[PDB]
Amino acid sequence: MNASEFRRRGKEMVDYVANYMEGIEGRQVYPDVEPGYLRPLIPAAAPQEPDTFEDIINDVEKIIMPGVTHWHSPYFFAYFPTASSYPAMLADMLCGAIGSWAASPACTELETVMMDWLGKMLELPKAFLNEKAGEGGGVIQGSASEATLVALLAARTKVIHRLQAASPELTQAAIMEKLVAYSSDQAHSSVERAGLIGGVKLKAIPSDGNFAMRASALQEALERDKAAGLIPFFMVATLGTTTCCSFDNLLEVGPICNKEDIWLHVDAAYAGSAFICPEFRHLLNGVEFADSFNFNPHKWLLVNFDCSAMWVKKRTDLRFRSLKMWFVFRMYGVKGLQAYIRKHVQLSHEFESLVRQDPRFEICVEVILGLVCFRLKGSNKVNEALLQRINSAKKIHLVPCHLRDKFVLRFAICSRTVESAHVQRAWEHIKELAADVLRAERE
Amino acid sequence: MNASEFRRRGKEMVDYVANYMEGIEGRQVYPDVEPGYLRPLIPAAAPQEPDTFEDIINDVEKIIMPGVTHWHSPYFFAYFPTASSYPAMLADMLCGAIGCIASPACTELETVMMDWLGKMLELPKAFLNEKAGEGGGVIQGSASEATLVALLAARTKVIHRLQAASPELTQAAIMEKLVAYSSDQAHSSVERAGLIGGVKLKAIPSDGNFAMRASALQEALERDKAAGLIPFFMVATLGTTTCCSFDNLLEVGPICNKEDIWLHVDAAYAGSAFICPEFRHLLNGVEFADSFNFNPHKWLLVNFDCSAMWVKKRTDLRRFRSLKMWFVFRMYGVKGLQAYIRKHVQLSHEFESLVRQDPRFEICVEVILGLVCFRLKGSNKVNEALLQRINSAKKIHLVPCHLRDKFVLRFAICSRTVESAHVQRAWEHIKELAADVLRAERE
Ligand SMILES: Cc1ncc(COP(=O)(O)O)c(C=O)c1O
Ligand SMILES: [Cl-]
Ligand SMILES: [Cl-]
Numbered sequence: 076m077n078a079s080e081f082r083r084r085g086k087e088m089v090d091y092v093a094n095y096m097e098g099i100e101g102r103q104v105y106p107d108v109e110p111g112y113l114r115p116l117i118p119a120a121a122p123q124e125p126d127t128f129e130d131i132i133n134d135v136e137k138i139i140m141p142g143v144t145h146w147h148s149p150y151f152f153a154y155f156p157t158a159s160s161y162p163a164m165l166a167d168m169l170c171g172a173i174g175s176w177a178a179s180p181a182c183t184e185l186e187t188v189m190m191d192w193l194g195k196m197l198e199l200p201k202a203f204l205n206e207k208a209g210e211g212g213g214v215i216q217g218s219a220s221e222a223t224l225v226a227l228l229a230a231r232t233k234v235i236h237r238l239q240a241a242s243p244e245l246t247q248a249a250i251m252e253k254l255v256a257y258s259s260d261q262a263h264s265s266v267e268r269a270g271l272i273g274g275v276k277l278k279a280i281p282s283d284g285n286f287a288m289r290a291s292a293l294q295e296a297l298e299r300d301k302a303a304g305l306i307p308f309f310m311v312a313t314l315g316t317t318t319c320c321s322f323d324n325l326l327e328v329g330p331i332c333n334k335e336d337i338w339l340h341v342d343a344a345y346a347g348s349a350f351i352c353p354e355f356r357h358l359l360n361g362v363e364f365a366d367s368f369n370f371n372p373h374k375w376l377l378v379n380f381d382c383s384a385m386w387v388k389k390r391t392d393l394r395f396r397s398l399k400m401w402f403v404f405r406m407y408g409v410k411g412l413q414a415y416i417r418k419h420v421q422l423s424h425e426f427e428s429l430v431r432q433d434p435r436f437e438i439c440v441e442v443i444l445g446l447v448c449f450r451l452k453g454s455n456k457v458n459e460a461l462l463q464r465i466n467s468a469k470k471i472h473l474v475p476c477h478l479r480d481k482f483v484l485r486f487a488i489c490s491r492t493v494e495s496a497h498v499q500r501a502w503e504h505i506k507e508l509a510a511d512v513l514r515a516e517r518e
Numbered sequence: 519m520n521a522s523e524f525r526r527r528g529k530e531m532v533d534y535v536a537n538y539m540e541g542i543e544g545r546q547v548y549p550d551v552e553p554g555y556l557r558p559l560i561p562a563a564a565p566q567e568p569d570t571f572e573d574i575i576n577d578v579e580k581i582i583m584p585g586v587t588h589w590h591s592p593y594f595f596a597y598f599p600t601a602s603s604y605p606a607m608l609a610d611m612l613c614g615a616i617g618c619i620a621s622p623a624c625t626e627l628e629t630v631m632m633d634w635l636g637k638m639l640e641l642p643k644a645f646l647n648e649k650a651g652e653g654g655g656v657i658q659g660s661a662s663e664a665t666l667v668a669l670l671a672a673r674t675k676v677i678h679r680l681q682a683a684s685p686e687l688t689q690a691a692i693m694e695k696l697v698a699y700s701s702d703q704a705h706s707s708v709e710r711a712g713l714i715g716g717v718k719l720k721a722i723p724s725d726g727n728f729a730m731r732a733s734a735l736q737e738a739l740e741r742d743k744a745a746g747l748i749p750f751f752m753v754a755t756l757g758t759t760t761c762c763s764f765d766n767l768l769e770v771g772p773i774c775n776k777e778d779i780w781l782h783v784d785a786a787y788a789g790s791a792f793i794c795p796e797f798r799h800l801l802n803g804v805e806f807a808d809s810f811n812f813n814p815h816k817w818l819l820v821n822f823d824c825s826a827m828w829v830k831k832r833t834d835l836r837r838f839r840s841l842k843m844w845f846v847f848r849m850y851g852v853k854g855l856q857a858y859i860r861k862h863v864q865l866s867h868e869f870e871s872l873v874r875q876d877p878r879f880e881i882c883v884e885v886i887l888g889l890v891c892f893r894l895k896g897s898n899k900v901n902e903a904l905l906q907r908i909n910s911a912k913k914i915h916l917v918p919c920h921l922r923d924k925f926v927l928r929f930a931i932c933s934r935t936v937e938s939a940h941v942q943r944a945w946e947h948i949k950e951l952a953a954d955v956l957r958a959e960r961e
Contacts, residue, residue, distance in 0.1 A: 085604075089611070123853050125848070135612065168531050174587075174599075174602055
């Protein structure tokens with residue numbers, strides 16, 4: 076098609092897309108249609124002459140939509156990794172119209188500036204800023220896995236140089252066999268992968284009663300290891316774990332890392348975004364000690380998933396993406412974005428209220444942000460039974476996890492469209508299915 | 519923002535983009551901006567309250583446009599890794615709204631579209647799976663990835679096979695001896711696949727027309743089997759990166775078969791043109807192939823992230839890519855697509871015959887489809903000069919290569935809206951600068 080066909084069909088498409096997102100409340104969260112349904116609804120060969128736009132869209136409603144998930148609804152109470160905000164979509168259109176530094180000076184420079192915005196919003200130390208400070212800095216990464224790996228390699232290179240300076244005798248290989256890294260029991264898969272790929276031993280630290288790393292468990296691990304002739308060099312402290320919103324106590328853990336020459340990497344998961352709100356900055360106290368800090372802004376800052384933001388204390392140790400950051404930051408403002416997290420935290424606590432009022436259910440971890448870790452009091456069996464009925468019903472979606480050896484229902488309020496109405500109706504449904512599940516238990 | 523706001527601003531973006539595409543001749547393809555220009559133009563921190571869309575789009579024109587490479591320009595006469603068509607743009611809007619990366623319609627629309635495109639290319643039924651056939655097609659992220667998935671597939675096959683015969687043989691001992699091959703003109707992607715796959719890669723010498731022939735291949739194989747190595751993988755290229763030459767698939771196919779070597783046919787650029795009867799013959803021999811791959815996003819107007827690959831045996835073997843195809847096929851129709859291809863071939867021939875009409879220039883390689891390999895008669899040095907004026911004048915832009923020892927100017931016609939008139943203006947500009955380059959030679 077030409078340009079002015081596009082102005083029309085494009086505007087038409089903005090309309091279709093808007094509608095979708097407005098009435099998404101109605102759609103069923105899971106497709107209620109089976110593998111195999113599609114082949115016979117569509118011609119066996121491609122059309123020779125062009126079909127109408129009119130006819131294609133109808134086909135998307137009638138043929139494609141039923142077979143689609145609809146992760147963008149308020150009733151999908153799990154993190155939806157590939158969601159996108161409206162400003163992200165606007166950018167995404169322009170980002171595709173355009174299509175190294177030399178190739179695109181705007182792409183690169185905007186990266187450097189947007190990281191600064193992000194840095195200031197979170198109120199990270201000044202040292203972390205790319206504002207020409209000549210020290211520290213920040214860069215975008217594809218995955219939080221990449222970041223964890225970069226910090227690790229950097230930490231590894233660093234300890235090797237230090238240890239070989241002390242004793243010129245030792246071999247690089249000799250040192251590597253002895254290197255240990257640490258993370259909390261609730262550390263993300265992306266840490267295991269980092270150490271696997273980086274060629275060092277990874278050990279979990281026992282977390283406390285609230286699933287946080289508390290030093291005493293850290294110090295012990297260090298004593299056990301230093302004396303078996305191993306060498307701690309690197310550690311990930313998690314802020315906002317993926318199992319529950321658990322925060323590793325940075326104030327206890329950092330001072331140890333400094334003393335023991337351990338490199339402190341802070342994996343702020345998705346939670347990091349919350350530090351643009353003052354109520355949460357105390358969870359970040361201790362960042363002073365950390366050598367690197369990583370988080371994914373996507374979940375709470377509405378930016379693109381493609382982006383994992385990461386800073387370092389010293390720059391020397393170490394897709395058109397900043398455009399979407401720019402749009403989203405500019406179209407919500409800090410206060411808008413704050414308003415946003417703040418709304419979800421409140422809906423999360425509204426849900427929590429509901430769970431405390433039903434004596435059949437217990438809450439497992441302190442609710443800090445959007446996620447609520449809750450379960451039915453009893454055996455794991457009972458609860459596995461329940462999550463099955465919730466999914467079977469295809470009305471809402473929840474994902475579980477284990478905590479120690481306990482099966483836990485995660486209720487996650489992340490979606491853009493969520494209101495308390497939805498939480499209200501969601502609770503009740505869960506409530507009704509528990510009733511049904513509970514009868515069964517007695518048989 | 520909210521839905522009703524997306525409506526207003528989604529449609530404003532739709533215009534902005536059409537405007538950009540209509541005025542794209544005005545733009546200078548390559549940005550000429552001084553390092554560090556962006557920062558003084560963007561505020562030090564994020565805004566607290568939202569900015570205006572007017573102010574945000576104004577900034578795109580002023581701040582972002584000058585720092586971008588306008589790939590879609592008709593005057594950018596090299597291959598453009600992103601082929602953005604309007605109906606591609608429309609599906610992105612939709613994929614955007616139904617976040618994808620589980621749903622019956624991802625997998626099925628994929629299979630169906632792969633039989634559509636397979637039928638269009640007149641592939642052997644063995645590669646299509648609609649008559650219950652065991653073969654079929656999957657869409658990959660890039661040819662680089664598709665080639666690696668094929669290599670690894672072969673490596674597994676061959677390892678399972680030799681170990682079926684000899685249970686005392688270890689994966690380790692077999693890998694040492696594994697050889698794969700491709701044309702001395704084959705795309706780097708192959709090199710990277712052997713490295714990750716950890717096998718030896720060897721280049722087969724091409725002939726007078728930069729084709730891989732039977733003679734040279736079989737020479738290679740005997741040399742390597744006699745050394746006690748193991749051929750397992752073989753890449754044949756249809757449409758080389760260098761001069762668009764075609765490996766002789768009919769010659770090489772049968773050799774791979776009786777030598778029990780996995781045959782992967784890579785057609786990344788030129789595969790699309792096999793939807794035209796005129797060109798389908800170059801693909802004869804696929805029958806012998808084990809896996810066939812090419813990139814439609816290159817020349818079939820699908821947006822960039824989309825590489826298509828069929829295999830004879832699926833058991834040998836992220837984004838919702840099949841929707842972008844479905845849009846593009848339905849909105850162009852087969853006749854519309856074939857038209858798009860034949861346009862580019864034609865302009866390619868228009869250019870070729872302007873270069874012949876001039877006694878100062880030679881054609882280097884047979885001009886098969888859409889790329890022209892030309893040269894000013896005399897020394898490489900005269901020709902390095904000429905490219906250095908073109909690339910300097912900033913009007914149009916060309917990427918050279920070497921053909922054996924000859925320095926060659928490539929001229930790719932590949933962009934949604936190159937027309938006859940662009941070609942001539944371009945050729946006029948080449949001749950001006952050449953008569954200049956020839957004046958220098960006299961001095
Ligand atoms: C011959 C050949 N092989 C492989 C590739 C890689 O294609 P892609 O950019 O999709 O990875 C190309 C160009 O894209 C090519 O021309
Ligand atoms: Cl979170
Ligand atoms: Cl504040």
